[PDB]
């Protein structure tokens, strides 16, 4: 019917992940990369899981889709391009995530 906002639906939030010594999470998927085992028709980037419960513990959740990173769009891009971008970033890494909604 219309765009959602103040209700249960596809939201758009940002997260601040400071690298010290590193981010603390892995990424999967990508257009032409190794592939993502979460979505069949979607070849985007997903945060499969987290190891250290500190940097991306309360920020990012397992199985989330990354829409944008530090201004660089992560849609329709190749995996190798996504990883290279995340690694080159300075200390504080600002990212945008979204939670799907389908009943």
């Amino acid at each position: 019917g219309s765009h959602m906002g103040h209700e249960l639906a596809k939201q758009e939030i940002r997260v601040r992940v400071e690298k010290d010594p590193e981010l603390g999470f892995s990424i999967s998927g990508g257009v032409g990369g190794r592939g993502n085992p979460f979505r069949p028709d979607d070849d985007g980037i997903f945060v499969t899981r987290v190891q250290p419960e500190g940097p991306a513990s309360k920020l990012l959740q397992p199985g989330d889709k990354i829409i944008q990173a530090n201004g660089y769009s992560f849609i329709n891009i190749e995996h190798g391009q996504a990883v290279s971008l995340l690694k080159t970033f300075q200390n504080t890494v600002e990212l945008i995530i979204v939670r799907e909604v389908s009943s």
Binding site: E22, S26, I27, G33, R34, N36, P37, H79, V83
Partner: peptide
């Protein structure tokens, strides 16, 4: 298999 990459 390999697919997950830790950044």
């Amino acid at each position: 298999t390999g697919w997950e990459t830790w950044v």
